[PDB]
Each structure stands twice: as C-alpha cells, then as structure tokens.
Design an enzyme around this catalytic site. Structure first.
Site, PDB file in Angstrom:
ATOM      1  N   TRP B 133       8.087   5.706  -0.876  1.00 43.68           N
ATOM      2  CA  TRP B 133       7.662   4.641  -1.340  1.00 43.68           C
ATOM      3  C   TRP B 133       7.317   4.997  -2.852  1.00 43.68           C
ATOM      4  O   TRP B 133       6.887   5.866  -3.189  1.00 43.68           O
ATOM      5  CB  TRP B 133       6.314   3.842  -0.778  1.00 43.68           C
ATOM      6  CG  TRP B 133       5.664   2.929  -1.274  1.00 43.68           C
ATOM      7  CD1 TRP B 133       6.406   1.627  -1.629  1.00 43.68           C
ATOM      8  CD2 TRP B 133       4.379   2.463  -1.350  1.00 43.68           C
ATOM      9  NE1 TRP B 133       5.453   0.618  -2.006  1.00 43.68           N
ATOM     10  CE2 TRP B 133       4.118   1.047  -1.661  1.00 43.68           C
ATOM     11  CE3 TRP B 133       3.162   3.057  -1.143  1.00 43.68           C
ATOM     12  CZ2 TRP B 133       3.169   0.377  -1.883  1.00 43.68           C
ATOM     13  CZ3 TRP B 133       2.147   2.323  -1.289  1.00 43.68           C
ATOM     14  CH2 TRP B 133       1.779   1.097  -1.809  1.00 43.68           C
ATOM     15  N   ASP B 214       0.766   8.337   6.087  1.00 43.92           N
ATOM     16  CA  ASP B 214       0.467   6.831   5.528  1.00 43.92           C
ATOM     17  C   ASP B 214       1.137   6.133   6.654  1.00 43.92           C
ATOM     18  O   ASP B 214       2.228   6.007   7.108  1.00 43.92           O
ATOM     19  CB  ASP B 214       1.563   6.720   4.347  1.00 43.92           C
ATOM     20  CG  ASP B 214       1.129   5.402   3.815  1.00 43.92           C
ATOM     21  OD1 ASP B 214       0.062   4.720   4.296  1.00 43.92           O
ATOM     22  OD2 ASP B 214       1.623   5.101   2.750  1.00 43.92           O
ATOM     23  N   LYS B 250       0.845  -5.470   6.923  1.00 49.61           N
ATOM     24  CA  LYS B 250       2.070  -6.020   7.332  1.00 49.61           C
ATOM     25  C   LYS B 250       1.968  -6.547   8.800  1.00 49.61           C
ATOM     26  O   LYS B 250       2.475  -7.464   9.201  1.00 49.61           O
ATOM     27  CB  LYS B 250       3.214  -5.008   7.393  1.00 49.61           C
ATOM     28  CG  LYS B 250       4.258  -5.220   6.146  1.00 49.61           C
ATOM     29  CD  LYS B 250       4.052  -4.019   5.319  1.00 49.61           C
ATOM     30  CE  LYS B 250       3.661  -4.716   3.877  1.00 49.61           C
ATOM     31  NZ  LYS B 250       3.742  -3.747   2.893  1.00 49.61           N
TER      32      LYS B 250
END
Lengths: 401, 401
Positions: B133, B214, B250
């Site tokens: 990311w 993560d 999300k």
C-alpha cells in the site's frame, strides 16, 4: 531475551490521577476540579441539544460512511473558517486560505506543528507561553521543534504580566514562531485585553514573527463568538497572516467526536492552493482522512440557521454558567470572611482557573475536604456547582486564612 | 516576501487522480476500478444494515460524548483483540497484551511506527513487500524509520514469489522489522497460502524479526474472519510476539468513522502495562484521544451476539460479492475468447486485483472503453458488477489481443 523489557514504565498523569483520586473519594460533597469538560449545574455531562437536533437531522438522511477528503469535509472546513474569521472577512472572499479538518485541536496543533517542521525554514523555535497547556510542549517536541517561553502569567497578581510578555516578546528573535492562545488561557485563565492585544500585534509585526493561534474555546469563553475571536481577527486585519487551530470540543460539546480544524491564512490563493497539497501530504501518513460524524454535525449546526441560532444560544448558557460560578466563588469567599483578594477569579476567562493557592494548600483541601485540583492551584471551574461552590469557598477560606 | 513561497505545489496522486478523471468522463458505460472502497452490485456505497441497527442501539441509549481515554474505548480494544485472535486464545486470557484504539488502520499504522522509532534500538529499518500500500512508505518514512523491500509479487505469474520472499526474509539482518499483510494484500491481492506461512514463520522466528501485521481486511477477504486472522494467530501460537494493525473501515463499512486498533502482544501482563503507558504517551501528542462514534458501533456489533451474527453474514455476503466478480470475470474473459491465462484473477483475495496489464492497455481502456484504474494494472474489484463484467471482460479482451 525479550522485545519490550527495554520499554520503560511511563510517568503518571497528574490530570488522570486527580480525577482518579476523585473517583476514589467517598465523600458526598466531593468535587473534581481536575475535570476537563463542561458539566451541567448537576455536575453531569451535557450533550448540546442542537447537537442532538443535528444528529437527528443527519439520520433522517440515510447517509453513507464513505471516506472523506484528506482535508475533511468541504462543508466543514469552509464553515469552520467563516466561524472563525467572520462573514464579511476578506480572506474568505479573496480565497486566500486553506482549512483542513483535523482531529480536534490537538489534531490542529500537530499537523500544523508538523507543517512547521517541514516548511518553516526560518526557524525551529516555537515560543509557548508561561505557563501553557500541558500537551503543548510534547506536541511540538515530537513534532520536531524547539520550545521557548515568554512571560505571560504573573504569579503574585494572578493576572497578565503584560509588561513581561510584551517585554519578552519584544526580545523574541525575528521570524520566530509565537503561540498565542486566542482566548481563555489554558490553564491560567488569564487573557490580554484588546488594547493589550493591540500592542502585541505591532510587536509581532515589527519582529515579523509568525503567529500561530489556538482557539480551543471560541464562544465558550464569553458566549460571544466574535469577541472571542477578536484577536485572531484583529491580527489579520493588521496584516499578519496567522494560522488557527480550532477545536469544537468545548464550545460544541463534541469532546469525543473529535471535531477540529487547522487554518492557514496566506497572502494569495495560489499559495493556499500549494499549502493545501502539502497539508494533505502530511496527513495521509498520519491517519488517512479524518473522522466522519463530527464534521457532519458541526457542519449541520453552522449551516442551518435555526440550529445555529440554537447552539449559539446554548453556548451562552454554558459560558454564562461558568461566569456565574466564578462570580459566586468570590462572593462566597468574601462572605466566609476571607481576607484576600480573589477578584482574579472573576477577572479570568474560561473554565480553567489559577487560584494562586499553593500545594500545601491543595493538600489540605484534598485530604481534609475531599476536593481535587492539581497543585499549580488551577481548578476546572466546570466541576463547580451551586451545590458545592460553597463547600469550595469554605475550604479555600479555611486554608488561605 | 511571503512565508510559504518556497512551499511548492505537490505531485499529483495517481489514485485520487484516476478517481477524479473517472468522475470527469461523460460516458454512460464508465467504470471506476480505482475506487478505494467496497460498492454494492449497484455500484453504490454500502452501509451494513447491522450498522444501522447498531447505530440505533447506541443512539437510543442516550450516550455521552466524553473524551475516551488515550487508548480509547476499553470495550472496543478488548473486543477487537477477541476478534483478531479468537475470543479465547490464551494471549487474551493471560492478559499479556495491550490494545489501544486508533484512527483506523492508517492511524494505527503510524502510531505503531512512531512506537518503533521511539523504543526500538534493534533496527531503524522496516521491510515492506514490493509492492505494498502506497501509504506504507510514508507512515514509516514520516515516523523516522528506514524502508526496504523484500520480493513478494511475481510479475510473471501475477502471484506470490514464495521463493524470493523466503530467500530475502531469511537474508534480513536479524531483529529488523518486517511488514506482513495478513490477508487481502494491497495492491497485488496476492496472499501466501497457509502452509507457506508456516514455512515463512520459522524464518521470522530464527532470524527473530519483529512481526508487524496489517490486517485491515479480516473477514472481508475470505468471508471467514477466523481464516483471515489465521496467519496472525498462527504467528502467535508459533511463539513470535507480534504487533497488529486492525482497520474496521472495509469489513464494517466504517470507512469515514475512522475505526481501528493497534495491538501488542507482550511477554506478560505487566510488560503490556508498560507498553500501554508508553503508547498512551506517544498518542497524546498526536491527537489527544481517538474518535467516539465508530468505536461505539463496532463495539456494539462485536458485543451483541445477534447484531454480530447479522454482521458476519453481511460481511461474507459482502465478501463473496467480490469473489462473485472475479469468478465472473474469468468466465466472460474466457467467453470473449481470450487466449491468455486469467487464473491469477481467481487465485487472488480481497477487493484489489493485479491483472498484469500493460500501461498501454490501461490507456486504451481508459480512452476507448472508459474504464479507470491505475497504470500498474490494479483493478478495484468492488467497482465491477454483474452488469459490467461483460463490458469489462469485453474491453480487457479487446486490449489484450
């Protein structure tokens, strides 16, 4: 061996203890003057109805929870600027500013503080007052800046050392960063008077220091937003491009909602355009974008007049209640036969007070009367109530006599 | 002579730019595969009904707006730890952990780095996968850490370079920090298969690296949160003490509420205490405390079994929608008569897919078929619908002959 056995136990927090010390006291006339938030006349948290009216207004709309621009709500940032600067401000009309939604004031200070690290090439020294909020130094320090002090509070008079602050400020190096609370000093409560503020602007102007402002208490300090923002508005009128940190925690009661903003006033719009992009860049890394609920509510209140008319009404009920407690604490001390001069308590603005009481005094109050405040001698005035302003006046008379 | 004329306009952002350049297209048949969030099969934002039911649950409660402690809502931190590790695995029952509430994954991500910069002698280097990311570099970069890369994506198979990832992690200097995506890797979508994880871990164990996970997509990835967290839980069961960044943006559709947690598993309950105090000390400077609303919604869903049951079904349903599309995409791409191997699209996990397209193909797609995605070949599978899998597969087949 292990990873974190090299990790030291941190130091205790005075503020947390004081309350914690408080939550422990059994007394029924016990008081928490260590409390950080506004409390109703029953020592009970208050949620502002207009906030509830907006919360309702939003829910009726069946909105999304989509990410928000890095800068935050468009509506919030703009509305938040107008609140601070006024309707007929030129900056607004010119377009020469950027406003970003930050996580509260503490969010405002940090982004701004970073942006200071990164782009403030004329210095590394940020001048904080004496004495200024506890989080200020470690906000800037981690931020990467140097810290400095200038006289503000005069301890014998429990007032403003104008000569002191003005004298010290005059001694600040050029193009250095000066942090001035817009109103309602934390934690002293001491503020400059407009004429005094006037003299500061010129001093900053002559020096060309950069002014960085914290307006964590707008509206809430006096109940007049405009007066409360008078200095920031004054500094700008007088040619000084400031930057402003706005917190809606107290004036709007969204303490946990975390509504805040950071404003930069620039010479021209283009510069603003530029500053914005970089403000963003700093942020993405910190959190992606700021929280959703708070801005919407805040926006809702500012942007709909009937609601705003209502909030700004409520802010007065609170500001005035605090004014009242302050006036009352003094009338009572004088009625308890207390010798001294407490007119400072009234002279002061906002919900934080510097009593001038000394720690040994605090302790008598704490151990003997179950009252809690830090040892600097400040109280949070919003822990005071009709019920207890008297238990308070009483002890203070007793210790200070 | 302005303050910020040395402050230059920043570089454009490809993701924000692609999304906007998509918004500018006038085609009825435009597609946004650069979108950073989940979308309904109607191409619309989705607010989980569980969140509405929960939002009503908390709203009817007439709840406070008080500051949360620095580590946030205690209830949320524990519940989020339960979610990530299993309501029961011992780490939780021994109390050898600390969980603080953070501003989403990103927030959680930087606080973690700031912690690493402050309390980690052992390394200044963080190893993140090539590729990761985009905001990984900056959070580490701004945090003060050094960044390096280990092989992860295989450009030839559009999959996992296990061989390279092993070779390199092994060759990492011991006690350095290495970043791992637990599931639904961004932007490749490539995840190591579990057995690979087991082999991967011993390397972590032997070289004794700190494991920085993560996990923003737990549950959203495969529909089974217990499967998605398996990498993390296995890393813990195999004896590697990890830190964890969890985002609820999300898989709860809490994108803008900014809900996240940072977790540390420690050796004992006390070390967790010391690490907690120091986390708190870091955080107060950054913003004093974390947001309130999202933590409340997440906490309710997490803790009311009936609301939670509805939430997990809504998540899988959500989860299989993306899977629904990838499985759909391949068929049409095959239906349109593509010769090429599209198995990688089905092998990958999450709402992000690396198709392996050439920037030139994207470009024909962008002008000709009006489909928007970054030039790396990344599609956001959440932008793909039952309707437009035909339009998309047709388009991709057309650019790929």
């Amino acid at each position: 061996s292990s990873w974190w056995t090299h990790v030291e136990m941190g130091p205790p927090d005075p503020i947390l203890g004081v309350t914690e010390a408080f939550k422990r006291d059994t007394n029924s006339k016990k008081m928490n003057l260590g409390v950080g938030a506004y409390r109703d006349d029953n020592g009970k948290p208050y949620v502002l109805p207009s906030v509830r009216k907006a919360e309702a207004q939003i829910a009726a709309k069946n909105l999304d929870k989509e990410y928000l621009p890095i800068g935050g709500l468009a509506e919030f940032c703009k509305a938040s600027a107008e609140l601070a600067l006024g309707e007929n401000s030129e900056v607004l009309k010119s377009g020469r500013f950027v406003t970003v939604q930050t996580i509260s004031g503490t969010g405002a200070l940090r982004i701004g503080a970073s942006f200071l690290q990164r782009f403030f090439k004329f210095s590394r020294d940020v001048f904080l007052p004496k004495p200024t909020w506890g989080n200020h130094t470690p906000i800037f320090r981690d931020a990467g800046m140097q810290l400095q002090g200038y006289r503000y509070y005069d301890p014998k008079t429990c007032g403003f050392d104008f000569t002191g602050a003005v004298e010290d400020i005059s001694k600040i190096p050029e193009q250095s960063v000066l942090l001035l609370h817009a109103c309602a000093h934390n934690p002293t409560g001491v503020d400059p008077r407009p004429e005094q503020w006037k003299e500061i602007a010129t001093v900053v102007k002559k020096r060309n220091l950069f002014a960085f402002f914290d307006m964590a208490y707008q509206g809430f300090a006096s109940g007049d937003g405009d007066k409360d923002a008078w200095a920031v508005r004054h500094f700008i009128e007088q040619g000084i491009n400031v930057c402003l940190c706005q917190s809606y925690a107290k004036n709007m009661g969204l303490y946990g909602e975390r509504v805040g903003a950071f404003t930069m006033v620039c010479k021209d719009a283009d510069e603003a355009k530029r500053v914005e992009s970089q403000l963003k860049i700093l942020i993405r890394p910190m959190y992606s974008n700021p929280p959703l609920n708070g801005a919407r509510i805040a926006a809702a209140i500012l942007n709909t007049p009937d609601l705003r008319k209502q909030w700004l009404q409520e802010v007065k009920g609170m500001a005035d209640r605090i004014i009242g407690m302050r006036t009352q604490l003094v009338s009572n001390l004088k009625k308890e036969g207390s010798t001294h001069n407490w007119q400072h308590i009234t002279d002061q603005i906002g919900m934080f007070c510097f009593t001038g009481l000394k720690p040994e005094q605090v302790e008598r109050l704490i151990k003997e009367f179950s009252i809690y405040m830090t040892k600097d001698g400040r109280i949070s005035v919003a822990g005071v109530t009709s019920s207890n302003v008297g238990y308070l006046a009483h002890a203070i008379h007793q210790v200070t006599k």
